[PDB]
Write a protein that binds this ligand. Structure first.
Ligand SMILES: Nc1ncnc2c1ncn2[C@@H]1O[C@H](COP(=O)(O)OP(=O)(O)OP(=O)(O)O)[C@@H](O)[C@H]1O
Ligand SMILES: Nc1ncnc2c1ncn2[C@@H]1O[C@H](COP(=O)(O)OP(=O)(O)OP(=O)(O)O)[C@@H](O)[C@H]1O
Ligand SMILES: Nc1ncnc2c1ncn2[C@@H]1O[C@H](COP(=O)(O)OP(=O)(O)OP(=O)(O)O)[C@@H](O)[C@H]1O
Ligand SMILES: Nc1ncnc2c1ncn2[C@@H]1O[C@H](COP(=O)(O)OP(=O)(O)OP(=O)(O)O)[C@@H](O)[C@H]1O
Ligand SMILES: Nc1ncnc2c1ncn2[C@@H]1O[C@H](COP(=O)(O)OP(=O)(O)OP(=O)(O)O)[C@@H](O)[C@H]1O
Ligand SMILES: Nc1ncnc2c1ncn2[C@@H]1O[C@H](COP(=O)(O)OP(=O)(O)O)[C@@H](O)[C@H]1O
Ligand SMILES: [Mg+2]
Ligand SMILES: [Mg+2]
Ligand SMILES: [Mg+2]
Ligand SMILES: [Mg+2]
Lengths: 562, 24, 376, 374, 158, 158
C-alpha cells in the first residue's frame, strides 16, 4: 500500500527493521489485545492506561510479535499501521477532503485485508476532520468498528478516555478497554534489563544490574508525577546522558541516585564521606545556629540520620515532631536551622502559620477547595509546595492556635505520608520533616507538665502519630550568655565587611541578658534588644562617621561605643 | 460563606471546511 | 448485567461470548461458563471466575494469611474473611457491596492496618486500597470530592475522586479512614453506597459499588481507654476491658452516626487493645521492616529473644499499642543503627546481632542497653 | 524546518549573528543532557519573560558550531519554530496540520533538526483543543520516542497551566530551570554584550553604566526580569545617545530609566549615604509644623537604612498616634515620595471597617472555596 | 396534547391517526377507534393510556396483594400507591398534576425504598426501571443543577 | 415606535400603513383609519391595541366575574389584576413600565398560581399561554443565564 504510507507508519515494517524498542514484559496484555483483535464483532482494543505505562509500547510489542510469528494465525502477516489522524486532517482544506482521504484509507484496508490499524491518541478520533459540515473521523469509522470489518487498536490515557471517549458513548462500545497498568518494580526492572542494550548503545555507557534495580526502586519511591516504566527509564537515560557530558563509562547505582538527587531534590545519593561526616556531626552544626535545646537537636538529628541511612519507614514521613515548649526558646529557630542544614536556606522551610487557621473553615488553604468551589484549580498551599519539593521541612507554627479539626487533615499526613488535595492528587509527604511547634505546685519532697498539656489539648491519635514529642527547656541565664555571643555575630559579620571589630565586655553581655531574658517569652526579646540597643546606635555612628575601617568598638541605650 | 466558581463553558469549534468555486 | 455498568446487555454479553471464543482460538474447543467468567474477570477486574484449588484453599485460610500481617484482632479478621468468602462463593447480595465494615476501637490496633492487609490479600499491594482519608472531609462542602461537581462548575469534567477510582476498579477495598472526622453530610452521601451500591457521579454516571469492600475505620468511642475505672462507684473491679469498650464504642457510634447509616453497615467490629503477647509478635512484624531494608544493603538484622522481649517491655502501652512499639524500635533500634551504619561500625556484608548487655531476663528495664555487634 | 516558520540558529551562530551568552553554562550543559537522551530528549527552558531562555538555546547553537557538543548534538541544525506564525493562516480545516506535517516531514528527512519552540504552552490546543488534533497530539508520538528533539521555553506559570495539566505531555518534556540572573551575573552578561552594543550604536559603553543598568533595573523595575530589563537600559541609552550626538555612563542609564518609571534622574543617580543626608529638609516640603516628628522619622530611616541593617526587619515600623489629619498620612505620603522617587507608593488599608476576625480572611485572602479569594 | 410536550398539536395528533391507521392496515392482512389511538400513544410515550385488559384490570385491583409479594406489611403505603396507580388507569388523576406524590416516612429498614422498587417492578417488571435520585449526594444548593441541568453558558449545558 | 422593539421607525411604520391598505383592499374586493392601523399591529405583534369590540368591552367589564369562574374568593386580588388589564385596554397605562406588576403573596394554596393561570386563561383562552417562570429552580447565582440567555460565544447563546 502507498495510501497507508502517507497517512500512517507501518509498525510491522518498523519491527522488521528493528526500529522499535523491545517490549520485555507486558506479554499478558499483548495476549489480551490479540484476543480482542481475533474477535468477530468489535475487534478493536483500546489500550487505556496512565501516561508512561507503555500503551504505545504494547502495540509496538504487538508489531514485534507479528514479525516474529508469535501471534495466532488470524494475526499472522498483518501490517500494523500507526494511523496518523493529523496527517489525514492535513491536506484537507475543502469540504469532503478529509472524508475522501478516510474512504481511500478504508478502501485500502478492505482491499488488502491484512491491516491492523493503530490509532494512537484515540481520544483525537472524535472531532477529527470536523468542520463546516464535515463527517468526523469517528462517524465514518463507527459502522466499520461495530461490525468487525475494521481492526483498529486504540491507545488513550485514562484521563483522556473518561473525557473524550466516554463522552461519545457510541464510540466507547466500539472499543474494548484493555487495561495497560503501570508495572510493578520487579516488572520495571525486567523492562530495564531488556532495554539495557538500547541505552548502553545510545550513550556508549555500561549500565549495571544494580543501576537498573535502583532506577526502578528509586523511581517508584521518590517520583510521584510520572509512571513506573518511564520514570525509571528517565533515570537510566539521564544518567547515561550525564555520563555523555562527563566524557566531554560505567553507570552504577550512584550515578542513578545522583540523577534522582538533581531532579527531585531529594538527597538519596550514595554518601560522600565528607557528607557522612556532616551528618555524624549534625548536632554541633545545628548548635551553630541554635543555642542549647539539646533534646531536640539530638532528636531531629536522629531523624535525618535515619533517613540518610535508609532506615526510615518508606510509608511515613522522614520525621514528625512536636516542638513543644515555652515561647521564644527556639522552636521556629531549630526548624530554620534544620532547613539550613538540609538546604542552605531559611526560605526552604515551608512555614504554615497555624494561628490563621483559628476557625474550622480555613483547612482548604492546606489541601485545596473541593470541586465546584473557588480556588479549585489553584488549590492547596501545603499540597502544592510539597508536590514541587517532596523533600522539605514543613513547619506548623503555633499548632495549638488552630482549630482541632485542622489536625484531622494532617493525621494521614503523619501516618501514611499522604495528603490528597481537593483535586484528588495525592501529594507525597513521605520525605518531609513535619514539625509542629507549640507554645502550649505545693508540698512534697516540665517534660511531664508539657506532655500532659498536649494530651489534654491534642487528640490521642494525633500524638500517637508524632514520631518524637520534644519538650523544650526554658533557656537558663548562661544559655542567654551564649546566645548574645551568637546574635552579635550577625552585627559583627557585617561590621567586618567594613573592617571594623565589635568586642563586648562581660558587663555588656550580662546587661543584654538581663534585658533579653523573660519568664513570659525569652530570647525573642533578646533578638529585639540587640538590634535596637547595639545595632541602631552603631548605624547612626556610621551616619555620624565617628567610626571607621581600622577601628574597634568596645561596648560596656546606656551602652558605650568607641 | 462558600462561593461556587461555576465555569462558563465557551463555544469552541474547529475551522470550517469550505466548498470551492471552480474556474476552468 | 451484574458485573458491568458501562455498556448495554446485547453487546456487553456478546463481547463476553466473542472474546471467550477468541481466547479459545488462541488455545487450539468449548466455551463454557468458566471461560466467560475468565473473560469478564480479565475485563472488569472483578474475580468471578471458577475458583482453582490453589485459591479455594487460600480463601479458606484467609484468616491465616491476614494474620501474617495482622497480629491478633481475630473477630476483625474473621469478619472481612467472611465477606470475601461469601463474595467468592456467589452468596452475596448482588444489589449491595461485598462487605460494609466499621473498624472501630483504639488507636494503633490495626484498623487502617487490616484494610491494607485485606487489599494486600486481594491484590498483592497495599496501594490497591482506595484510602479515602476522611479527616480532610470535616468541611460539609467537600462531599463533592466523592462524586464530583454538578453541571456548571469546575471539576465537572474531572467528576469524582471516589466514583472514578471505582469506575476503574469495581472490585476494590475502599477505606474511609477516620470516618468520624468527616462532616455529618459526608457519610450521608454514602447511604446509597452501602445499601444500593450506587454513587452517581457529577456527570450523572452511576458507579457500581456492589463489588467493593467498604471499610470505615474509626477511633470513635475510645477515650476511657487510658482509664482503668470510670468516674462512678462500681460493684465489680474485674476485666470488662474491651467489654465496656465495645459498649462505649457502640454507644458513641450511635450518637455520632444516624441509625440508618449504622443500619447499612454489615458489621461494626470494635477492636481489642493489643495485649502483651500480641506486642511480642508485633515486634517481629516491625523488626522485619527494618531487617528488610538492611537486606537491601546486604545486612542481616538478627534480634535475640532478649532484645525482642525488651522492645516489647519498652514499647507496650495498653492505651495505644504498636505505635509506641514502632516509636520504640525507631528510637532504640533504628536510630542506633543509623549511627552505626554511618560510622562504619556495622556495614554492608555483616550481620547485626542485637543483644542486651545490661538487665535480668524478665525485669522491667530502666537501665538496659542494646548492643549491636557486627559479625562477618 | 524550513526558513518559513523558524530560523536556523545554528547557521546564525556560523555567521556570528547570535549574541554572546555569558553565564548560563550550567543550563546549556543541562539542555545537552536532555538532548543527549535516547527517548524524550526534549528540554523545557522554564523561566520568566526575559531571563535568557532563548539565550540558552542561542548559547547551545553557538556550542554546536564550536564543536562543544557530545557527538549526539554535532552538526544539528537548530531551528526555531514560531508556532504563532504556524497557527496564523488557519481559517480552514487542515491548514495548521498541513503546515505542521510539512515541518515534521522536513525533520524526518534531514534527521539533524532540533526544534526550539519558544512559548511551548501554545502547543496545547494550538489546532483546536486537548482532545482534538492539535499541535500537541501531532507531536506527542515522536516526542515520546526521541525522534523529534524539541527545546521548549515556557514560564513557570505556563508550564504549570498547560504542560503539567496536560496528562501525557508532562512526561515528553524535561524541565530545565532557567532562573533570573543575579545583578553580578547580569553585569557579566552586559560586559560580554559590551562589544555588540558598542559596535551597533557606535557609542562607547563604560563599566559604570553596566553596573548601573543591572543594579537600578533590579531595584526600579519589578514587572520585568534582570537580563532583559538591564540590556534594555543599555540599548535605549545607546539609542538616545544617537539622537543627541560619545559615551554612555552611570548618569545616562539613570536618565533612560527615569523616563520609564517617572523618578527624576537625581533620585536614580544618587547614593543612599548622601541620598539620605539632606533627608530632613526634603521632608519639610510638604510637612510644615510638627517638626520633631519629621526629624524623628528622618533619623529612624537613616538608622534603619544606612550603615547596618539586618535583612530580617522592615525599613521602619511606626505608630503614628495623636490628633487625626494633622499630618499623619500627609507625612507618610511625603516619606513615600522620598522613598525611591514615586509618590504612588502609599497604600491605605483603612482598618476601621474591620471589627471581625472573619474579615481577616477578607483582608489576607480567603481560604479557597470562600468569598474574598480575588 | 396531553401526553406529549416535545411535539406540536396538528402533527402529534396526525402522528397518532397515521400510525394507528398504519397499524390497522397491518392487522387487516378495519376501523381506527380511540383504543387504537391509545395503543399507538402507549407504544410511543410509554404511558399506559389504552383500554384496560380484563387481565390487567384484575392485576390493578389486585395490586395491594401483588405488592405484598415483595412488601411485608406496610399496608397503609401499599394501598396508598395502589390508589395512585388505579386513579391513573381509571383516568381520574388530575392531568396537570403527577400520578402520585408520596413521602414515605418512618423508621429505617421498614421498606420505604423497597416499596418504591416494588412499585417500579409492578409497573415495569424491573425494579431498575425506578428512577432513583439518591438525595444524600445533594449536600449544598448548587447540586440542584444535577436535576435540571446547567444554565446556558456553563459546562454540562449540553 | 411604542409597540415594537425589534424593527426601525421608517419601515416599522410603513409596515403598518402598507399592510392596512392591503387588508383594506381585500375588503373592497376605501379608508385606512387609526383603528385599521391598530388592527394590523394587533395581528402582527400580538398586542391588543385595537379598539375594543362590544363583546370584548363588556367582557372586560365582567372580567372579575369571569375570573371568579375559575378562582374562588380572593376578591382583592381579582380586582387588582382587573384594574391592571383595564388600564391597558383603556390605552391608559404608563408606557415606560409593564402593563401589570404584582406580588401575589400570602398562604400556600389559596390561588396565587391559580389567579395567574386564570388571568392567562382570560386573555388567551388557555392557561398554558402563561409564561410560567418557576423561580424555585433559580436559587443558584448564575441560573440568571436561563432568564436572559448566555452571552455570545458561550454555549447556548443562540
Ligand atoms: N513492557 C515494556 N518493555 C519495554 N519498554 C517499555 C515497556 N513499556 C513501556 N516501555 C517503554 O516506556 C517508555 C514509555 O512507553 P510508551 O511511550 O509506550 O507509554 P504510553 O503509556 O503509550 O505513553 P503516553 O500515554 O504518554 O503516550 C518507552 O521508552 C517504552 O519503550
Ligand atoms: N536556642 C536558640 N538559639 C538561637 N536563637 C534562639 C534560640 N532560642 C530563641 N532564639 C531566638 O529567638 C528568635 C526566634 O524565635 P524562636 O523561633 O526561638 O521562637 P519559638 O521558640 O518558636 O517561640 P514562639 O512559638 O513563641 O514564636 C530569634 O531571635 C532567635 O535567634
Ligand atoms: N493488629 C495489628 N497487626 C499488625 N500491625 C499493626 C496492628 N496494629 C497496629 N499495627 C501497626 O501499627 C501501625 C499503625 O496501624 P494502624 O494504622 O492500623 O492503626 P489504626 O488503629 O488505624 O490507627 P488510628 O485508629 O489512630 O487511625 C502500622 O504501621 C501497623 O504496622
Ligand atoms: N416492608 C418490607 N418488605 C419486604 N422487605 C423489606 C421490607 N422492609 C425492608 N425490607 C428488606 O430490607 C431491605 C432494606 O429495607 P429498605 O431499604 O427498603 O428500607 P427503608 O425503610 O427504605 O430504609 P432507609 O430509610 O434506611 O433507606 C430491603 O431491600 C428488603 O430486602
Ligand atoms: N382561590 C382559589 N380559587 C380556586 N381554586 C383555588 C384557589 N386556591 C387554590 N385553588 C385550587 O388549588 C390549586 C393549587 O393552589 P394554587 O397553586 O393556586 O395556590 P398558591 O397559593 O398559588 O400556592 P403556593 O402558596 O403553594 O405557591 C389551584 O390550581 C386550584 O385548583
Ligand atoms: N546569559 C546571557 N548572556 C547574554 N545575553 C543574555 C543572557 N541571558 C539573556 N540574555 C539576553 O537577554 C534577553 C533575554 O531574552 P531571551 O534570550 O529571549 O530570553 P527569554 O526567552 O527568557 O525572554 C536577550 O536580549 C538575550 O540575548
Ligand atoms: Mg504513547
Ligand atoms: Mg516560633
Ligand atoms: Mg431507603
Ligand atoms: Mg403557586
Amino acid at each position: 500500500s502507498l495510501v497507508l504510507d502517507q497517512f500512517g507508519r507501518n509498525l510491522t515494517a518498523a519491527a522488521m527493521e528493528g526500529k522499535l524498542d523491545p517490549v520485555i514484559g507486558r506479554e499478558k496484555e499483548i495476549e489480551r489485545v490479540m484476543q480482542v483483535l481475533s474477535r468477530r464483532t468489535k475487534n478493536n482494543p483500546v489500550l487505556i492506561g496512565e501516561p508512561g505505562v507503555g500503551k504505545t509500547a504494547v502495540v509496538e510489542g504487538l508489531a514485534q510479535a507479528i514479525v516474529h510469528g508469535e501471534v495466532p494465525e488470524t494475526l499472522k502477516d498483518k501490517q500494523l499501521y500507526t494511523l496518523d489522524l493529523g496527517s489525514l486532517v492535513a491536506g484537507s482544506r475543502y469540504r469532503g477532503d478529509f472524508e475522501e482521504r478516510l474512504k481511500k484509507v478504508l478502501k485500502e484496508i478492505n482491499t488488502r485485508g491484512d491491516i491492523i490499524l493503530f490509532i494512537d491518541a484515540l481520544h483525537t478520533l472524535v472531532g477529527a476532520g470536523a468542520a463546516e459540515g464535515a463527517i468526523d473521523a469517528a462517524s465514518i469509522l463507527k459502522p466499520k468498528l461495530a461490525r468487525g470489518e475494521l481492526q483498529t487498536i486504540g491507545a488513550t490515557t485514562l484521563d483522556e478516555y473518561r473525557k473524550y471517549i466516554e463522552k461519545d458513548a457510541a464510540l466507547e462500545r466500539r472499543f474494548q478497554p484493555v487495561q495497560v497498568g503501570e508495572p510493578t518494580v520487579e516488572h520495571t526492572i525486567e523492562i530495564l534489563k531488556g532495554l539495557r542494550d538500547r541505552y548502553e548503545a545510545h550513550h556508549r555507557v555500561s549500565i549495571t544490574d544494580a543501576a537498573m534495580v535502583a532506577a526502578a526502586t528509586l523511581a517508584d519511591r521518590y517520583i510521584n508525577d510520572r509512571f513506573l516504566p518511564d520514570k525509571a527509564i528517565d533515570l537510566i537515560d539521564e544518567a547515561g546522558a550525564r555520563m555523555r557530558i562527563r566524557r566531554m563509562a560505567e553507570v552504577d547505582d550512584e550515578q542513578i541516585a545522583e540523577v534522582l538527587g538533581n531532579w527531585t531534590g531529594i538527597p538519596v545519593f550514595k554518601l560522600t564521606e565528607a557528607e557522612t561526616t556532616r551528618l555524624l556531626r549534625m548536632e554541633e552544626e545545628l548548635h551553630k545556629r541554635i543555642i542549647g535545646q539539646e533534646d531536640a537537636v539530638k532528636a531531629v538529628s536522629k531523624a535525618i540520620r535515619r533517613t540518610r541511612a535508609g532506615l526510615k519507614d518508606p510509608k511515613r514521613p522522614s520525621g514528625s515532631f512536636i516542638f513543644a515548649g515555652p515561647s521564644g526558646v527556639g522552636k521556629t529557630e531549630l526548624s530554620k536551622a534544620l532547613a539550613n542544614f538540609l538546604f542552605g536556606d531559611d526560605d526552604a522551610l515551608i512555614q504554615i502559620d497555624m494561628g490563621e487557621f483559628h476557625d474550622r473553615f480555613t483547612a482548604s488553604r492546606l489541601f485545596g477547595a473541593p470541586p465546584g468551589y473557588v480556588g479549585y484549580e489553584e488549590g492547596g498551599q501545603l499540597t502544592e509546595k510539597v508536590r514541587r519539593k517532596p523533600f522539605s521541612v514543613v513547619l506548623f507554627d503555633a499548632i495549638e492556635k488552630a482549630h482541632q479539626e485542622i489536625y484531622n487533615s494532617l493525621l494521614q499526613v503523619l501516618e501514611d505520608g499522604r495528603l490528597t488535595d481537593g483535586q484528588g492528587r495525592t501529594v507525597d509527604f513521605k520525605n518531609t520533616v513535619l514539625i509542629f511547634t507549640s507554645n502550649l505546685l505545693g508540698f512534697s519532697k516540665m517534660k511531664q507538665k508539657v506532655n500532659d498539656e498536649l494530651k489534654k489539648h491534642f487528640r490521642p491519635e494525633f500524638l500517637n502519630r508524632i514520631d518524637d514529642i520534644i519538650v523544650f527547656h526554658q533557656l537558663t541565664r548562661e544559655e542567654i550568655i551564649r546566645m548574645v555571643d551568637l546574635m552579635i555575630s550577625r552585627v559583627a559579620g557585617q561590621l567586618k565587611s567594613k573592617d571594623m571589630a565589635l568586642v563586648l565586655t562581660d558587663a555588656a553581655k550580662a546587661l543584654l541578658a538581663k534585658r533579653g531574658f523573660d519568664p513570659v517569652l525569652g530570647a525573642r526579646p533578646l533578638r529585639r534588644t540587640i538590634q535596637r540597643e547595639i545595632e541602631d546606635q552603631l548605624s547612626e555612628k556610621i551616619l555620624f562617621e565617628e567610626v571607621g575601617p581600622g577601628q574597634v568598638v568596645t561596648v560596656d541605650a546606656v551602652f558605650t561605643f568607641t | 460563606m462558600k462561593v461556587l466558581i461555576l465555569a462558563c463553558l465557551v463555544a469552541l469549534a474547529l475551522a470550517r471546511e469550505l466548498e470551492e468555486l471552480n474556474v476552468p | 448485567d451484574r458485573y458491568i455498568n458501562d455498556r448495554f446487555l446485547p453487546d456487553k454479553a456478546i463481547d463476553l461470548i466473542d472474546e471467550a471464543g477468541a481466547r479459545m482460538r488462541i488455545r487450539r474447543a468449548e466455551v463454557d461458563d468458566e471461560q466467560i467468567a475468565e473473560v469478564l474477570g480479565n475485563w472488569t477486574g472483578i474475580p468471578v471466575f471458577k475458583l482453582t484449588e490453589a485459591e479455594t484453599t487460600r480463601l479458606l485460610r484467609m484468616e491465616e494469611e491476614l494474620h501474617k500481617r495482622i497480629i491478633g484482632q481475630e473477630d476483625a479478621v474473621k469478619a472481612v474473611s467472611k465477606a470475601i468468602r461469601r463474595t467468592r462463593a456467589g452468596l452475596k447480595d448482588p444489589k449491595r457491596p461485598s462487605g460494609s465494615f466499621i473498624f472501630a476501637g483504639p488507636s494503633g490496633v490495626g484498623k487502617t492496618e487490616l484494610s491494607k492487609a485485606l487489599a494486600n490479600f486481594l491484590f498483592g499491594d497495599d496501594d490497591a486500597l482506595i484510602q479515602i482519608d476522611m479527616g480532610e472531609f470535616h468541611d460539609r462542602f467537600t462531599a463533592s470530592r466523592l462524586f464530583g461537581a454538578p453541571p456548571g462548575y469546575v471539576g465537572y469534567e474531572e467528576g469524582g475522586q471516589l466514583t472514578e477510582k471505582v469506575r476503574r476498579k469495581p472490585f476494590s477495598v475502599v477505606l474511609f479512614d477516620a470516618i468520624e472526622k468527616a462532616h455529618q453530610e459526608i457519610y450521608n452521601s454514602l447511604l446509597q453506597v452501602l445499601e444500593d451500591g450506587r454513587l452517581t457521579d457529577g456527570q450523572g454516571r452511576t458507579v457500581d459499588f456492589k463489588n467493593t469492600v467498604l471499610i470505615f475505620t474509626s477511633n470513635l468511642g475510645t477515650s476511657d481507654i487510658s482509664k482503668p475505672v470510670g468516674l462512678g462507684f462500681s460493684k465489680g473491679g474485674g476485666e470488662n476491658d474491651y467489654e465496656r469498650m465495645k459498649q462505649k464504642v457502640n454507644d458513641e457510634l450511635k450518637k455520632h452516626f444516624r441509625p440508618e447509616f449504622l443500619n447499612r453497615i454489615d458489621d461494626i467490629i470494635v477492636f481489642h487493645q493489643l495485649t502483651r503477647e500480641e506486642i511480642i509478635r508485633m515486634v517481629d512484624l516491625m523488626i522485619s521492616r527494618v531487617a528488610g531494608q538492611l537486606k537491601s544493603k546486604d545486612m542481616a538484622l538478627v534480634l535475640t529473644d532478649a532484645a525482642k522481649a525488651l522492645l516489647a517491655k519498652r514499647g507496650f502501652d495498653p492505651v495505644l499499642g504498636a505505635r509506641p512499639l514502632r516509636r520504640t524500635i525507631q528510637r532504640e533500634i533504628e536510630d542506633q543503627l543509623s549511627e552505626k551504619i554511618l560510622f562504619e561500625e556495622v556495614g554492608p556484608g555483616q550481620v547485626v546481632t542485637v543483644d542486651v548487655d545490661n538487665w535480668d531476663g524478665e525485669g522491667p528495664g530502666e537501665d538496659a542497653v542494646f548492643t549491636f555487634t557486627g559479625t562477618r
